[PDB]
Enzyme design. Structure first.
Site, short mmCIF file in Angstrom:
data_model
loop_
_atom_site.label_atom_id
_atom_site.label_comp_id
_atom_site.label_asym_id
_atom_site.label_seq_id
_atom_site.Cartn_x
_atom_site.Cartn_y
_atom_site.Cartn_z
N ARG F 355 29.88 6.25 -17.97
CA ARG F 355 30.25 4.95 -17.43
C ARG F 355 30.33 4.94 -15.91
O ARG F 355 30.38 3.86 -15.32
CB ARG F 355 31.58 4.50 -18.02
CG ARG F 355 31.60 4.53 -19.53
CD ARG F 355 32.80 3.81 -20.11
NE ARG F 355 32.82 3.89 -21.56
CZ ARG F 355 33.65 3.21 -22.34
NH1 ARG F 355 34.54 2.38 -21.83
NH2 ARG F 355 33.58 3.37 -23.65
N1 LIG Z 1 24.82 -5.23 -18.47
C1 LIG Z 1 24.69 -3.92 -18.71
N2 LIG Z 1 23.54 -3.32 -18.36
C2 LIG Z 1 23.39 -2.01 -18.60
N3 LIG Z 1 24.25 -1.17 -19.18
C3 LIG Z 1 25.38 -1.79 -19.52
C4 LIG Z 1 25.68 -3.13 -19.33
N4 LIG Z 1 26.95 -3.43 -19.80
C5 LIG Z 1 27.38 -2.28 -20.26
N5 LIG Z 1 26.49 -1.25 -20.12
C6 LIG Z 1 26.68 0.14 -20.54
O1 LIG Z 1 28.03 0.29 -20.94
C7 LIG Z 1 28.75 1.05 -19.94
C8 LIG Z 1 30.04 0.34 -19.61
O2 LIG Z 1 30.80 0.12 -20.82
P1 LIG Z 1 32.01 -0.94 -20.86
O3 LIG Z 1 31.64 -2.20 -20.21
O4 LIG Z 1 33.22 -0.24 -20.25
O5 LIG Z 1 32.32 -1.15 -22.41
P2 LIG Z 1 33.69 -1.10 -23.23
O6 LIG Z 1 34.85 -1.43 -22.35
O7 LIG Z 1 33.48 -2.08 -24.38
O8 LIG Z 1 33.75 0.32 -23.79
C9 LIG Z 1 27.79 1.21 -18.77
O9 LIG Z 1 27.99 2.46 -18.10
C10 LIG Z 1 26.43 1.17 -19.45
O10 LIG Z 1 26.08 2.42 -20.01
MG LIG Z 2 36.34 -1.39 -21.17
#
Ligand SMILES: Nc1ncnc2c1ncn2[C@@H]1O[C@H](COP(=O)(O)OP(=O)(O)O)[C@@H](O)[C@H]1O
Ligand SMILES: [Mg+2]
Ligand SMILES: Nc1ncnc2c1ncn2[C@@H]1O[C@H](COP(=O)(O)OP(=O)(O)OP(=O)(O)O)[C@@H](O)[C@H]1O
Ligand SMILES: Nc1ncnc2c1ncn2[C@@H]1O[C@H](COP(=O)(O)OP(=O)(O)OP(=O)(O)O)[C@@H](O)[C@H]1O
Ligand SMILES: [Mg+2]
Ligand SMILES: [Mg+2]
Lengths: 365, 46, 166, 487, 50, 523
Positions: F355
């Site tokens: 992330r």
């Molecule tokens: N718009 C996007 N484009 C590309 N990858 C994305 C996007 N949104 C999320 N990701 C992927 O998810 C990761 C972030 O996860 P996150 O938003 O924290 O989800 P959650 O909080 O539901 O676990 C990024 O590092 C990437 O791998």
């Molecule tokens: Mg999150």
């Protein structure tokens, strides 16, 4: 020296299954201490208890090694002054023993030089070995995909009627008979007839020379035995192997069948001890019990112990806590599958789910 | 279809049993931890 | 003069003169990093002057520590320091920093790194000190005479089955 | 026993985060706040919140800090009321914790009023009907599940599907130009994510330290004990309520993650003598969440646009917590891991999303008709996929393949690069207008772009960007053909 | 033991007005020496088996 | 002038590795979560931790050492302080327990500190090189990051983390000690032999000088296994709060939860899911929140966490596995099928994610990683659904990703660059590793006397930092790199591949097979 609590007198206060509470006026002896019931009680055999917990400064909870039949409250108990000790040395070679170390072969007295307690501390880090070599078993699947390591730990995970016992006998025939060192067979919660067959086989092969020098010791606490004995026979058998490894610097083979019954036995007593069960219903101390037992089964700088343990998978569920926790304590893992056996393939090893630690070019060719 | 149905019907039976066991274990734990106090009643007048 | 502020808006100490004096009094250049560590802990971020002093200590220091350290290299340490300064601190190295690197390459006899640094100064900075460029070429031609232009084992002819894959 | 301010009690039991307090004069009212005045050599003050009454004198409480160095019989003093948090425009641009204490190290905050975190939800008569579309600049949300101003929005998703990213995009698109104020409540999430948000907001001038800010932050995170994570949401909600009622402003309320509020209460439920319910959550799961959710609503005085992120444990939407939250929302956005694994972002499953304003009376007729046609085509495409899997694409009829070819373009055209995910994607984001999205999809459905290459719809904005990408694809293909021709 | 007990009593300000009393207890854990406990203050001057 | 302790009661009951205490009437009392000493002898004490304070006055104690010596009726003294352990540079290269006691081989830090505040952190922008091309490219790791390592038994979970620690040895020797990466390897519930094997392995590569081991073997009580991660991170927080960077590895959190479950159930705590205590998420949550990247104002130090987690039959729906996944900033999923399929490390890129993103990658790796990512994505879809460049280059990328030992940054980046720009299109997939070996450990241009480069040669290891500064697509370095790879490709194809494709003899065929397999385990 002599223990300060030997001869201490206590009275039975509570009896539930194989669990008995003993109240000592002068103070409960140390944990793991052994006690003998003095009252006749009309029993056919003596009654021995092992302390496992302290309820208070005077009351202690214990597990009985024999059946608790005809046991009344207020019965008199006497401390033995120490833990459960078993014979050690060459005098035990060619003999059959039980959890308490009493010979059950109906032969002459053991006449051991000394005895050692079943409960002992494991080798420390500085006393660990660094020798890796291949033990050739003669079986194609094992020698190729999951080769065994001399002085290492091997596990045979399998269901019911899959071939665990057969492979052990094959390993015994192909290794133990042509083995320079000593061997110890620990039967734990297994068929009594198998022990008899093994004893006859070892006599015919002259690994037990009744009139000469023998290379094998048998220690058996079987299914018929109460849970208390099945939870300690492995310790006693392991203690004899430890003596050969250290006090004599001799290579030892340790064939344990079955190790799952050890965990099962501790589960049965734990339910009676008044402990909250973990998942499935096993005792919360499942991992710790295996850790203490397995860590003693290792090769030190003084000697080597090659251990082969049979693991029973209940309901063919390999995710059960008992077999699952045992994977981390084994150098080699041999998983058997019922479906493979039903296809006519014996042994039923599932190579994909098997593993070995010496599968390294730095060790094998 | 006859092999995945059995595993589906075998799974639901196990799932019900385990969840119920968990709850009863918690119930027994909270019952065991509980301790009854001294009974403040007129014992002499019995 | 003008107060600096950090990422979150808090102010940072800018009086970094005493720390430079401490750096200029070290014996082994590894001790210089400790001074930089103390500066960061005290919320006194190093400036361009501080990094140049650190490079000077590296060039003028005998060794990394009192006891020898295997595979220690002055050039590697200075380049990593520059990488930290430009990327993780947003400060452009000046001519002085690159000159120190070129001097180290000349002093150590590494004549191939000198060529690369020579182009860097000719690209970012304005040329190279012609004294150092000539010194590097002299070292290179000495190797040609002595034959140490490349490690010898590389020049050995090999084959498909004549290579020992460890 | 009316005014319990300053009432004294003694600690009687300490087990984990649950502490029992004995008062000789009678336990204060539930939800009351207590301070541990005894000097125990602690580096942080200890405060407790009463949650139950064991008897007329004993009360069970949850601590907001770690219970380390806490001894029995330790003295405790009531604060005379529930936990209070500052409110007003003086809190703008600031970061707070569950207790309402600033943690930004930016000096004292001038508070003219404080309000308790526990309040009664609005009644039926205090409900306002606001049916207005909210333009988030996202093709999928604006089309299939349009959001409503003053309503409640849920982002249901697993771990790593993009819940946090979408919230950041919504903030960047809705909060920068928002007329009113904003409140962000971090609940049981990563601390670094809060730090990144704070930096971004400062850069975007939402939080203007020298000028005037227009957002508040309230953070209770994983590191905090369960007691804090079970009340931080109430604190932020209290701030938003004040802005709604007293200031009469239209406020935004972002919450991430609301599940942690349920999780924290389940952790303490075992120690409160409550039998676990199914799966292992507390029996009061539905009621506790309902009280909080009903407070998050738009009344006749003001409006609160709420965006809440819901974690679906192990991608199991049948779990009690995700399911219980579905009935308390006006627009649900369900994210699927399979979609994300295919390179489609945002990984929205339009067949599982829903919106209350998806009615012709509220939105334009063209918008409603286009959305329904898209959903039907996607549904049909999934059924045809089974046949493509078994029979193969060859055996599909002329009509079916046209659905397949058009539907695949719809699937890729729903994807959109966000302005906040440039690092993840490496491309600039796009902000698609509502009208552009409707027209672009309407033309696609009727085959106006049947000759456009499929990949031209992948990770782009409006129709114009599609044409530009197709032109670029054509140019590079021509160059490759020229290179092959020379060979 | 009496001297040690008196010294501990002097150190404790709370027990300034309290009267000192000595109560002997037999501990099998110590083979030699003695220990003194007063209001939680424990002083060990004993040895056990080697 | 007496060493007066604080007696608080006696030992009432003992149940395995836990105990209960009854306070003597009119005594000061003990504080929660503090350390106590059970006087097993007039000169010997056993350590315990306070866990419960009941209404009856009874106290729940977690024993840590000398359990066998504990008996009912013994005296208990209260230190009145939390757990503090030795910390500093003097512990490196040693094996210690969670209590700080050193284990023979053949400053005080508080274990219950709070995590850094929100304003005390900074964005992750410094990379931490694991040494594996797959991870460093597709799964970036940055200092101050928590990267889970989840997989099944016997999949490389331990090996990859150990390799990551080892890969820092070469770097630390060259750069200043300021940027050196210290290592805290924590073994939990593992076999004692495995710890010794790891200790020897680290010693062979010289990693002990920058690494310390904290071991809580299986034979040890659950209390030590429960405190090992907290003690290990505490040793790593010493460097974080002093402008230095550290890497904490936990092997593994799965067995920590078991120990915590064992302790809670024995001490009469209500069970939860799978019998785990209700507050099992909060256990790991506060453990991993302590790993951060401190802001410039506090020193700039960091702690990087690599917790390890085991699954059953590739089931990531379990309880503790899900909780840890929802905490860390990314996960490396090691798949059993890939491991048996010959792919090692068996990193499942589809199920793995970081992330932090490209922010944790060096400027040199950003361009290579970004373009590489698109090619693989297409390669996965093309095969799932005609020798296209994406599909040609993707297969060779996967072949390059196989490794046995961590790779130096210069060697890895330059091989990825070559495969990216089509220099390996003419090279068969089977021979990619052999091509890489010659590129790194040999120089064809010098062998055949066709090398006209001035400085850019693969034997000049000092070029790694120049590459890491300017990027490989820069005028200073681009031209010589292209010429170096252009000569290498031509020489390799002409003199090696032609002969390799002309082998028919069984002896020659077998010899070639051994060579290529060895090249996999060499580069
Ligand atoms: N718009 C996007 N484009 C590309 N990858 C994305 C996007 N949104 C999320 N990701 C992927 O998810 C990761 C972030 O996860 P996150 O938003 O924290 O989800 P959650 O909080 O539901 O676990 C990024 O590092 C990437 O791998
Ligand atoms: Mg999150
Ligand atoms: N190698 C083999 N070759 C042929 N048949 C075999 C082989 N191994 C096992 N079998 C068959 O399987 C039966 C059961 O084998 P075995 O006695 O080893 O069971 P097990 O694994 O010990 O199970 P359990 O002890 O729980 O009954 C044998 O009686 C025999 O019919
Ligand atoms: N990159 C690799 N290439 C080849 N073999 C590898 C690689 N990584 C690990 N192995 C080997 O795979 C086996 C398992 O590795 P490892 O000890 O890391 O597993 P693990 O995840 O720790 O499993 P467990 O600890 O449960 O046994 C070992 O024989 C190890 O040498
Ligand atoms: Mg059998
Ligand atoms: Mg491992």
């Amino acid at each position: 020296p002599v223990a300060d609590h030997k001869g201490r007198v206590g009275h039975v206060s509570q009896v539930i299954g194989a669990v008995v509470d003993v109240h000592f006026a002068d103070g409960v002896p140390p944990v793991l201490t052994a006690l003998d019931v003095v009252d006749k009680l009309g029993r056919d055999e003596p009654l021995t208890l092992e302390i496992v917990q302290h309820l208070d400064a005077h009351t202690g909870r214990c597990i009985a090694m024999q059946t608790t039949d005809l046991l009344k409250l207020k019965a008199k108990v006497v401390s033995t002054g120490g833990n459960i000790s078993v014979p050690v040395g060459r005098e035990t070679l060619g003999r059959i023993f039980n959890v308490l170390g009493d010979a059950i072969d109906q032969r002459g007295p053991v006449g051991e030089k000394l005895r050692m307690p079943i409960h002992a501390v494991a080798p420390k880090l500085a006393d660990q070995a660094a020798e890796d070599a291949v033990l050739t078993t003669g079986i194609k699947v094992i020698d190729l995909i999951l080769p065994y390591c001399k002085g290492g730990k091997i596990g045979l995970f399998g269901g019911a009627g899959v071939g665990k016992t057969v492979i052990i006998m094959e390993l015994i025939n192909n290794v133990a008979k042509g083995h320079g060192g000593f061997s110890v067979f620990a039967g734990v919660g297994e068929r009594t007839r198998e022990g008899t067959d093994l004893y006859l086989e070892m006599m015919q092969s002259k690994v037990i020379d009744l009139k000469g020098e023998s290379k094998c010791v048998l220690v058996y606490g079987q299914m018929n035995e109460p849970p208390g004995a099945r939870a300690r026979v492995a310790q006693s058998a392991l203690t004899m192997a430890e003596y050969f490894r250290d006090v004599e610097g001799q290579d030892v083979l340790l064939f344990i069948d079955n190790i799952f019954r050890f965990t099962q036995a501790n589960s049965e007593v734990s339910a009676l001890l008044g402990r909250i069960p973990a998942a499935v219903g096993y005792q919360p101390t499942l991992a710790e019990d295996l850790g203490q037992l397995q860590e003693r089964i290792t090769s030190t700088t003084k000697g080597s112990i090659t251990s082969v343990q049979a693991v029973y998978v209940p309901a063919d569920d390999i995710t059960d806590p008992a077999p699952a926790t045992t994977f981390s304590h084994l150098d080699a893992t041999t998983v058997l599958d019922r479906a493979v056996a039903e296809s006519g393939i014996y042994p039923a090893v599932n190579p994909l789910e098997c593993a070995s630690r010496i599968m390294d070019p730095d060790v094998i060719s | 279809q006859q092999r995945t149905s059995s595993l589906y019907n075998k799974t639901r039976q196990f799932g019900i049993t385990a969840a119920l066991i968990e709850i009863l274990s918690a119930m027994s734990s909270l019952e065991g931890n509980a301790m009854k106090g001294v009974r403040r009643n007129k014992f002499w007048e019995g | 003069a003008a107060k600096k502020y950090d990422l979150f808006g808090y102010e940072v100490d800018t009086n970094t003169a005493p720390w430079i004096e401490k750096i200029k009094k070290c014996k082994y250049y590894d001790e210089a990093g400790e001074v930089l560590v103390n500066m960061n802990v005290s919320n006194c971020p190093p400036d361009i002057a501080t990094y140049n002093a650190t490079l000077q200590c590296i060039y003028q220091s005998p060794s990394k520590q009192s006891t020898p350290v295997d595979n220690e290299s002055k050039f590697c340490a200075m380049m990593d320091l520059l990488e930290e300064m430009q990327h993780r601190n947003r400060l452009k190295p000046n001519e002085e920093s690159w000159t120190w690197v070129m001097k180290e390459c000349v002093k150590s006899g590494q004549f191939r790194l000198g060529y690369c640094i020579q182009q860097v100064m000719e690209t970012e900075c304005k040329g190279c000190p012609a004294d150092l460029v000539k010194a590097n070429e002299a070292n290179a031609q000495k190797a040609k005479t002595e034959g140490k232009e490349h490690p010898g084992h590389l020049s050995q002819q090999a084959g498909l089955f004549d290579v020992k894959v460890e | 026993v009316a005014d319990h301010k300053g009432r004294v009690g003694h600690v009687s039991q300490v087990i984990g985060a649950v502490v029992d307090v004995h008062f000789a004069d009678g336990v204060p009212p539930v939800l009351t706040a207590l301070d541990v005045v005894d000097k125990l050599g602690r580096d942080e003050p200890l405060t407790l919140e009463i949650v139950q009454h064991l008897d007329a004198h004993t009360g069970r409480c949850i601590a907001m800090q770690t219970t380390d160095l806490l001894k029995l019989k330790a003295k405790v003093v009531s604060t005379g009321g529930n936990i209070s948090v500052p409110v007003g425009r003086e809190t703008l641009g600031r970061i707070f914790n569950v207790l309402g204490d600033a943690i930004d190290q930016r000096g004292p905050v001038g508070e003219k009023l404080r309000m308790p975190i526990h309040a009664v939800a609005p009644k039926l008569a205090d409900q306002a009907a606001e049916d207005a579309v909210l333009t988030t600049g996202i093709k999928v949300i604006d089309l299939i599940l349009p959001y409503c101003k003053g309503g409640k929005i849920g982002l249901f998703g697993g771990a790593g599907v993009g819940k946090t990213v979408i919230i950041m995009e919504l903030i960047n698109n809705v909060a920068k130009g928002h007329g009113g104020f904003s409140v962000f409540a971090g609940v049981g999430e990563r601390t670094r994510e809060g730090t990144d948000l704070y930096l971004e907001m400062m850069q975007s001038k939402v939080i203007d330290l020298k000028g005037e800010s227009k957002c508040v932050l309230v953070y209770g995170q994983m590191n905090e004990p369960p007691g804090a994570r079970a009340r931080v949401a109430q604190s932020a909600l209290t701030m938003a309520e004040y802005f709604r009622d007293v200031e009469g402003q239209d406020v935004l309320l972002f919450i991430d993650n609301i599940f942690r509020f349920t999780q924290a209460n389940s952790e303490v439920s075992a120690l409160l003598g409550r039998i676990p319910a199914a799966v292992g959550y507390q029996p009061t799961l539905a009621e506790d969440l309902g009280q909080l959710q009903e407070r998050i609503t738009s009344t006749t005085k003001g409006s609160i646009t709420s965006v809440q992120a819901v974690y679906v444990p192990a991608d199991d939407i049948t779990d009690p917590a995700p399911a219980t939250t579905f009935s308390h929302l006006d627009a649900t956005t369900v994210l699927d891991r399979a979609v994300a694994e295919s390179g489609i972002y945002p990984a929205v499953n339009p067949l599982e999303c829903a919106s209350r304003i998806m009615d012709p009376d509220v939105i334009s007729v063209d918008h409603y008709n286009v959305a329904q046609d898209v959903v039907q085509m996607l549904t049909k495409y999934r059924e045809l996929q089974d046949i493509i899997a078994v029979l193969g694409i060859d055996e599909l009829s002329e009509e079916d393949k046209l659905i397949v070819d058009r539907a695949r373009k719809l699937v890729k055209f729903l994807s959109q690069p966000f302005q906040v995910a440039e690092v993840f994607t490496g491309m600039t984001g796009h902000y698609v207008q509502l009208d552009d999205t409707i027209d672009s999809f309407s033309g696609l459905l009727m085959g106006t772009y049947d000759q456009v290459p499929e990949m031209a719809f992948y990770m782009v904005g409006g129709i114009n960007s599609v044409l530009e990408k197709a032109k670029k694809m054509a140019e590079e293909a021509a160059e490759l053909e020229k290179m092959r021709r020379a060979r | 033991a009496r001297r040690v007990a008196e010294e501990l009593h002097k150190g404790l300000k709370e027990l300034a007005d309290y009267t000192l009393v000595l109560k002997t207890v037999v501990d099998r854990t110590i083979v030699k020496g003695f220990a003194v406990e007063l209001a939680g203050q424990y002083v060990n001057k004993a040895e056990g088996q080697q | 002038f007496f060493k007066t302790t604080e007696m608080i009661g006696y030992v009432h009951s003992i149940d395995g590795t836990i105990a209960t205490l009854i306070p003597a009437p009119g005594n000061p009392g003990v504080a929660y979560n503090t350390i106590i000493q059970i006087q097993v002898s007039p000169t010997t004490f056993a350590a315990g931790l306070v866990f419960n304070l009941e209404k009856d006055g009874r106290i729940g104690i977690i024993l840590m050492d000398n359990i066998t010596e504990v008996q009912s009726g013994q005296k208990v003294m209260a230190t009145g302080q939390l757990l503090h352990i030795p910390v500093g540079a003097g512990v490196l290269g040693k094996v210690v327990n969670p209590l700080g006691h050193e284990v023979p081989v053949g400053t005080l830090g508080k274990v219950d500190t709070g995590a850094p505040n929100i304003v005390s952190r900074s964005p992750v922008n410094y990379n931490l090189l694991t040494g594996f091309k797959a991870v460093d490219t597709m799964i970036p790791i940055g200092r101050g990051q928590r990267e889970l390592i989840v997989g099944d038994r016997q999949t490389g979970k331990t090996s990859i983390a150990v390799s990551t620690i080892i890969n820092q040895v070469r770097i630390n020797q060259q750069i200043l000690s300021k940027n050196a990466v210290i290592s805290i390897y924590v073994s939990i519930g593992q076999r004692c032999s495995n710890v010794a094997r790891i200790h020897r392995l680290l010693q062979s590569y010289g990693a002990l000088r920058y690494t310390t081991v904290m071991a809580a073997t299986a034979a040890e009580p659950a209390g030590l296994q429960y405190l090992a991660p907290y003690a290990g991170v505490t040793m790593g927080e010493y460097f974080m709060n002093r402008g230095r960077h550290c890497l904490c590895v936990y092997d593994d959190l799965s067995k920590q939860a078991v120990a915590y479950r064992q302790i809670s159930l024995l001490l009469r705590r209500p069970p939860g899911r799978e019998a785990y205590p209700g507050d099992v998420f909060y256990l790991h949550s506060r453990l991993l929140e302590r790993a951060a990247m401190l802001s410039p104002g506090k020193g700039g130090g960091s702690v990087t966490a690599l917790p390890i987690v085991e699954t059953l039959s590739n089931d990531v729906t379990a309880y503790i596995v899900t909780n840890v996944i929802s905490i860390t900033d990314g996960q490396i999923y090691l798949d059993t099928k890939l491991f048996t399929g010959g792919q090692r490390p068996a990193v499942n890129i589809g199920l793995s994610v970081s992330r932090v993103g490209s922010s944790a990658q060096n400027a040199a790796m950003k361009g290579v990683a970004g373009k590489l990512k698109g090619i693989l994505a297409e390669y996965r879809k093309l095969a799932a659904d005609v020798q296209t460049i994406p599909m040609i280059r993707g297969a060779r990328f996967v072949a390059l990703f196989n490794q046995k030992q961590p790779s130096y940054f210069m060697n890895a980046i330059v091989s990825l660059y070559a495969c990216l720009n089509g220099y390996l299109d003419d090279v068969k997939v089977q021979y990619v590793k052999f091509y890489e070996y010659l590129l790194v450990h040999r120089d064809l241009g010098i062998m055949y006397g066709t090398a006209k480069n001035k400085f850019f040669y693969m034997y000049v290891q000092e070029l790694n930092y120049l590459i890491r500064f300017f990027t490989l697509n820069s005028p200073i370095l681009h031209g010589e790199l292209e010429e170096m790879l252009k000569q290498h490709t031509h020489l390799f194809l002409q003199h090696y591949q032609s002969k390799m494709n002309a082998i028919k003899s069984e002896k020659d065929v077998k010899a070639l097979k051994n060579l290529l397999y060895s090249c996999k385990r060499a580069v």
